Amino acid sequence: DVRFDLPFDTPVSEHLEYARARHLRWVWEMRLVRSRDGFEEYKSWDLPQAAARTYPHASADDMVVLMNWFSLAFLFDDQFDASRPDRADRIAEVARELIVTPLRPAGSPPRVACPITLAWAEVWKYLSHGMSLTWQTRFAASWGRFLVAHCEEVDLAARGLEGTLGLDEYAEFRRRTVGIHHSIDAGERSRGFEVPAQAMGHPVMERMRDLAADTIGFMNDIHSFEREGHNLIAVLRRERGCSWQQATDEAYRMTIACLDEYLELQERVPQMCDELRLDEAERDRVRMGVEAIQHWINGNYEWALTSG
Amino acid sequence: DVRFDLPFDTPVSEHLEYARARHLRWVWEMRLVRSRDGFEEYKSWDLPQAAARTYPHASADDMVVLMNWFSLAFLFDDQFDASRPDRADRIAEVARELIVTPLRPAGSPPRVACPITLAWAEVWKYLSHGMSLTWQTRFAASWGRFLVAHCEEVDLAARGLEGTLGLDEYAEFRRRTVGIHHSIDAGERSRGFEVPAQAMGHPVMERMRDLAADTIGFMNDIHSFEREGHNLIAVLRRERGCSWQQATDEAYRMTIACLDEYLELQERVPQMCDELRLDEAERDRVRMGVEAIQHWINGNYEWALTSG
Ligand SMILES: [Cl-]
Ligand SMILES: [Cl-]
Ligand SMILES: [Cl-]
Numbered sequence: 001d002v003r004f005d006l007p008f009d010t011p012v013s014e015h016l017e018y019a020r021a022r023h024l025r026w027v028w029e030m031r032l033v034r035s036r037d038g039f040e041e042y043k044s045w046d047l048p049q050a051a052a053r054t055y056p057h058a059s060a061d062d063m064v065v066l067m068n069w070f071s072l073a074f075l076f077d078d079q080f081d082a083s084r085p086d087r088a089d090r091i092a093e094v095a096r097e098l099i100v101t102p103l104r105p106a107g108s109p110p111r112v113a114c115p116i117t118l119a120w121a122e123v124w125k126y127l128s129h130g131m132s133l134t135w136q137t138r139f140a141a142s143w144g145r146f147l148v149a150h151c152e153e154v155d156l157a158a159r160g161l162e163g164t165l166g167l168d169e170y171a172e173f174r175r176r177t178v179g180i181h182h183s184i185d186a187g188e189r190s191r192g193f194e195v196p197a198q199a200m201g202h203p204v205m206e207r208m209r210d211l212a213a214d215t216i217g218f219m220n221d222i223h224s225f226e227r228e229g230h231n232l233i234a235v236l237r238r239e240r241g242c243s244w245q246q247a248t249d250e251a252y253r254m255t256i257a258c259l260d261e262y263l264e265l266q267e268r269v270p271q272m273c274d275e276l277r278l279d280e281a282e283r284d285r286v287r288m289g290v291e292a293i294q295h296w297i298n299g300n301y302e303w304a305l306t307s308g
Numbered sequence: 309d310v311r312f313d314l315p316f317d318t319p320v321s322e323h324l325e326y327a328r329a330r331h332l333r334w335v336w337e338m339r340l341v342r343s344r345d346g347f348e349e350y351k352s353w354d355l356p357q358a359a360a361r362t363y364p365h366a367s368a369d370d371m372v373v374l375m376n377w378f379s380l381a382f383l384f385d386d387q388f389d390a391s392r393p394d395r396a397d398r399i400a401e402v403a404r405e406l407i408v409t410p411l412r413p414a415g416s417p418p419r420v421a422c423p424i425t426l427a428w429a430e431v432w433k434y435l436s437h438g439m440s441l442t443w444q445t446r447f448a449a450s451w452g453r454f455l456v457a458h459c460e461e462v463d464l465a466a467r468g469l470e471g472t473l474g475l476d477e478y479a480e481f482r483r484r485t486v487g488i489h490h491s492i493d494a495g496e497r498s499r500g501f502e503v504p505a506q507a508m509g510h511p512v513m514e515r516m517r518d519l520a521a522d523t524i525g526f527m528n529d530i531h532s533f534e535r536e537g538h539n540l541i542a543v544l545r546r547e548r549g550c551s552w553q554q555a556t557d558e559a560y561r562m563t564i565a566c567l568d569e570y571l572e573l574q575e576r577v578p579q580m581c582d583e584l585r586l587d588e589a590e591r592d593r594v595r596m597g598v599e600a601i602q603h604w605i606n607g608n609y610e611w612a613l614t615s616g
């Protein structure tokens with residue numbers, strides 16, 4: 001069992017039990033689960049815990065909105081009859097409704113009405129509340145890129161094409177499908193700040209987000225693999241024709257290499273702020289931005305340890 | 309006939325005839341027009357001229373890409389059999405493919421393949437070329453908001469609901485449907501600069517884009533009206549129960565009031581740059597940003613004068 005020793009110490013929200021309880025009633029009220037068995041399957045994933053570790057500064061009511069959101073993505077596949085002929089077309093259709101919801105005024109009804117799209121129209125109204133147009137645009141494209149990539153994964157599987165990606169293509173693709181850019185963006189909503197726009201578009205920060213997404217997608221592949229061809233481990237083994245264990249070792253080395261480059265860019269943040277000429281309150285907002293990334297890398301890891 | 313005397317003097321591209329000729333062959337090569345009559349109808353709109361007045365600094369090859377893009381939006385309705393039962397559903401479907409194209413790597417094939425989506429997948433690869441992730445995100449959300457709003461207009465008509473918007477809702481809606489935010493964004497691609505991100509998200513610039521969009525949507529309604537219920541003039545008349553001429557006068561007064569507020573914010577740009585602490589090359593990029601807005605307001609007007 002691959003363990004990582006990460007150099008972060010990261011808070012956990014005090015609102016876990018308060019918000020879990022509301023969140024669990026909400027999944028029923030919004031008809032995202034339909035049977036007792038489906039519900040208990042959903043509960044076993046312990047998504048509330050992930051939300052509490054990744055958004056640790058949220059107010060209690062916002063922790064509820066965050067858990068609700070968290071559930072949308074993970075329940076998304078499970079909204080559709082798995083044996084129907086055109087499953088992959090219905091998924092694309094629903095995903096695209098989720099993509100346009102942040103591109104229309106908050107409170108507008110979705111065109112494709114199903115439990116997930118109605119749930120998301122609700123959540124987006126809260127998640128966007130109080131946030132600038134700059135943040136909403138950034139979120140909207142991050143979320144959109146994620147969902148497009150999710151549709152590509154779904155089509156890859158429906159077409160009989162899992163196992164065809166080589167290492168470099170797989171790594172590029174996994175950066176997209178892991179959905180961490182929009183996850184980081186929401187840190188600003190959860191804690192009530194916005195990162196200065198000239199810092200968000202600086203090469204250091206853009207690269208940091210990409211490495212955070214690599215690191216997390218690769219840890220998640222290592223973790224899913226250890227409990228079972230579209231998986232970093234499998235891909236490495238096909239690519240190198242090595243043992244299952246040499247492929248594990250190499251996945252581990254790739255992950256630590258992403259992490260270490262992430263840590264090097266972290267130490268460069270003060271120089272970035274100097275080159276941008278940021279004042280002290282801007283610097284402070286940057287620092288909080290970097291912490292949202294740490295919450296994701298560390299919190300995701302610590303949640304994965306306790307199963308799901 | 310309402311005339312406006314605008315306080316802008318605005319260049320026109322020298323590449324009009326060079327690019328028109330390539331652009332006209334392209335609309336056939338991409339199968340956007342299908343008959344000689346459809347083509348001559350397309351030619352009468354003189355979209356090349358609009359592109360030459362709105363993107364006057366484009367290189368010659370980029371002027372071609374801009375005209376090609378211009379054509380996509382205007383040909384879009386005309387790609388679909390107008391009498392089929394579910395026209396409005398097919399439009400939404402195609403619009404959403406156009407929305408996700410900028411949310412996936414350049415050169416990827418569209419999932420819904422038809423002449424317009426293939427054409428756009430091509431155009432986006434050139435339009436995004438050399439542009440930062442910040443610009444592509446901004447463009448992508450602007451274009452997306454436009455297309456969503458276009459689908460809302462299409463559904464409004466298919467449902468028998470034209471003529472139901474009151475004045476305030478109509479004004480809000482027309483800001484969305486006129487599609488000027490993404491039009492302004494492309495000025496940076498055409499001329500080869502990017503506006504500093506902290507200026508783009510400043511309240512002055514965000515408001516300037518909104519007023520430019522009002523001004524242009526209202527001029528375009530005045531101009532379409534004078535050559536014929538979803539029209540500023542008609543809406544004002546329903547709202548005020550006034551004469552067709554008093555409704556025209558009032559549309560004219562609303563437009564001049566948007567314009568004058570636009571002109572007041574224009575004079576505030578140097579103070580904005582001071583409050584942001586921009587250096588001189590950043591100031592210069594801002595100034596070019598403002599010129600892209602002027603090119604749109606002035607160029608659209610001067611193009612409208614010569615019919616279509
Ligand atoms: Cl947080
Ligand atoms: Cl998520
Ligand atoms: Cl392979």
Ligand SMILES: [Cl-]
Pocket residue numbers: 192193194195285
């Ligand atoms: Cl802030």
Ligand SMILES: [Cl-]
Pocket residue numbers: 362363364365366495498499
């Ligand atoms: Cl230009």
Ligand SMILES: [Cl-]
Pocket residue numbers: 377378381487491
């Ligand atoms: Cl356009």
Ligand SMILES: [Cl-]
Pocket residue numbers: 471472473474546547
């Ligand atoms: Cl009315």
Ligand SMILES: [Cl-]
Pocket residue numbers: 500501502503593
């Ligand atoms: Cl520039």
